[PDB]
Amino acid sequence: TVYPLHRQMLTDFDIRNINKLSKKKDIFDILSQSLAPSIYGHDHIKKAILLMLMGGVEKNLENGSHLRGDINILMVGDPSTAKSQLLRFVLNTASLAIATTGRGSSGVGLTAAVTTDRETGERRLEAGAMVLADRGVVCIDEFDKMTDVDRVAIHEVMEQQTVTIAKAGIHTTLNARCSVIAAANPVFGQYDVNRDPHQNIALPDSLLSRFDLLFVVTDDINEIRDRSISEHVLRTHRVTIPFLRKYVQYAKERVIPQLTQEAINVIVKNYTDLRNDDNTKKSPITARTLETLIRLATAHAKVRLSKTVNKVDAKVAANLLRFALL
Amino acid sequence: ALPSIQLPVDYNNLFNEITDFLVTFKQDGPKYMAMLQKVANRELNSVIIDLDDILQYQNEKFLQGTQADDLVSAIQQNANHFTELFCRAIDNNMPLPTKEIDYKDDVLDVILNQRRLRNERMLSDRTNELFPPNLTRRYFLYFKPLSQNCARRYRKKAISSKPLSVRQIKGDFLGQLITVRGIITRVSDVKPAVEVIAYTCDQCGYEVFQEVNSRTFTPLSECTSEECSQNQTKGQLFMSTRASKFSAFQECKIQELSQQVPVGHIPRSLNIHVNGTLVRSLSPGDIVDVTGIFLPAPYTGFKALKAGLLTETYLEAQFVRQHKKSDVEERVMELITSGDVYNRLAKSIAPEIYGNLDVKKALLLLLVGGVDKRVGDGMKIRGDINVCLMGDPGVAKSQLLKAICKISPRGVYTTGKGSSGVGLTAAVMKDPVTDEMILEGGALVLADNGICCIDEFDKMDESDRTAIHEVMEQQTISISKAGINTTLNARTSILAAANPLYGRYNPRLSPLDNINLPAALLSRFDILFLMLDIPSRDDDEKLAEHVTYVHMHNKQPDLDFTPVEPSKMREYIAYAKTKRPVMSEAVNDYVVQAYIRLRQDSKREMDSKFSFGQATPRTLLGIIRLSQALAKLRLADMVDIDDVEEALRLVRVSKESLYQ
DNA sequence: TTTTTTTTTTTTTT
């Protein structure tokens, strides 16, 4: 027989609830909160995660290269940010893909050419991590601790979004299209906040470009906050998620939003506003970071289950990038 | 012992249907009567038998009765026997004379002529069971697919037809003629194979013909011939290689499309054989609709190892349909009369990327390059335009190159890793599978007398660096590796997209600080354009509107330009390199004078700061070669004073962009 | 009655 296990089965009565909830306009935040039962806030990060959980559609050019629609993000901050444990939530609800602590390799998703043969005189490849993760979530503990040599194919993982294999060998370029999130610690101590982002990167450079978001999370102390920090942590040891997976899955295939010019009439103003301002504060800024406005907006567009993109979704994007850089 | 069971399938009458199928027909005299002759006439080898006319002929055999048994479906359900039967009857109605056969003329034509003449004459003495029909052919048989608009007659389902993925490929497809699509990979070089293969005998001679069946066979000597046999003791016999026939064989794997595949599941490449006139039809990395007979070929072995028997099979080639294969100066003559060849065609470069036509302006110099010169001794003076990019991070300058090599003659699109040292220097990279130790120079060898296009040019390491460091002396690449000491021509044109070190170039910083390359290698290029991306609340508007013009539309440009397509353009660009301008002396002396103050202001600025000086000779060399480039954009050959000056505008414009 | 095998991981090293 060989049954798979954990798709899914929605009947009627269920999806009727999916849509019954879909009508409500605060549901985005709601879905965001239920993600981390123990974890405090970081709702902007949560939202970001769901935004990656849709896939943000896709658009394939005719007779040309694709425009990546899936979302790639990274976490950074002092230890005990719950970054790894936060990844372990993206371990189960997400419907794949596989997560890794740093190492990693050989070439991760690279097959690394099973050799020799196995069997009957036929040299063979086999599913690598990132390959196995095709159209799924790669997660990384200590993406800062991975080898500099791995990083090469990692660039190949994100922009090129494929896998090139010359090794023995078979020259296949196979689709690496994947949603990928990782976490990195401050290169040196607690100075993540004090030091500039330069040298705080821990993984320059083009690696930074492909990232839709860099999230600095401070361990900084507020005793006012620390009381709150305590009580929920103590009642720890002492709005539904499974349905959230049943909903997300449905929002993938039905339906893709396309676009409306309403988001466009704003996020443009926003982008130039970034370039003429965000350079008087910090860096970087590229066309790519704007292409994320497309993806972000599109993600929330799937969250509204709107048949099309809408201006307020773009307002959700304009929301997310502010807190991305501030 | 071998149970045997009746089935509706019978070859008996189908043979007859094949006789009436060929030489008797109209709609396409008929195609089967005199083309068959043209094969026997020796003007053609491939016999192309379309599934199309099998369908239309069954339109003659059914509709239009009397009704006939199934063909194309019976064909693609078996696929192999129909070349051993449908083709075997072809011997019967083939024209005798045919026309102008000669004898030699053709080598071995007299061999077989005198084969059967000495055979019948040595058979004439004995009479005073024949050389197999497959021995004398000189024609291959290729079936071709029916897509088809006339398959809509219809037989409906029976059409495959579809170019299914190898994932879609199945075990019941053994012995089934089908369409498959996918990329060519590794494409084993053409080799002879074998067919009958007559081995001579030693004492009384005669001959015997061992059929070539399967992939291997037992060789044999003894003596078969009754006269050399039993007296005495046995006539020895050896193979005669000119008595042999070889069918053409080139086997090539075809990889899956990768979007045919489920999301996981690494690409599965499949094994294919080539036979016949369709040899050389397929080259590496080529998507094609490839149709062919798919058969098991066990084993050799191993054997008892496999079990179950576990065939491992293979595909044979049948048909190839390849996706995407003066009055030409007249096609150029709307552009000749257009005027503004240089600025307009400069706008025509990468019409996708908006802005910086000043950059495209020099790219124009590149596409044509030219003219070189030969000093008469001689040692070439390039002649080749090595211009480099700069600025960062993305800029989509990669697009400039991406389109350039796509259009510019003999282009190579590369990057740091990328084309290696051995990706640029001919060595001895062991050949995978088919053996051995073949030599492949990449990049600077692969497409020569044409542009090399680089990105990540600082990540080329030192592997490429010293060799290309030679290629600015051009006209060579030396290799002392292994036993081969040659210096092979890299006549390649050079261009790179220079991506400065992380994360962007810093305006306060002195030039070459951003650049991680050697100081000696940047005087080796002629000119370079640094691309700074500076936020402007004006241009980033039209930019973001340019980014939002996607995904709203497909076509970007308007109000207004009409893109200039590569074919017609490339023909003027190849029309120009022939022109070969010759500098007038007036413009020559002018090339000296302003170049003196060019040799003064880069020097009188002294300390590097802005820099670089000196306006070295290579910028004059260049400026001259750039007017030699600019003239062919004018045709001329007279090299105008402003034909020099237009390069003079690009001189400083290249630099001084280091300010903003 | 015998068949047939070089990458990938890790290591110690200038």
Ligand SMILES: Nc1ncnc2c1ncn2[C@@H]1O[C@H](COP(=O)(O)OP(=O)(O)NP(=O)(O)O)[C@@H](O)[C@H]1O
């Ligand atoms: N709301 C919360 N916020 C932060 N940490 C939490 C929270 N709830 C639990 N934790 C705990 O905080 C710790 C988070 O560690 P975490 O940073 O995720 O691992 P890590 O990052 O791989 N260690 P490091 O690499 O040094 O940053 C775990 O022990 C969690 O159980």
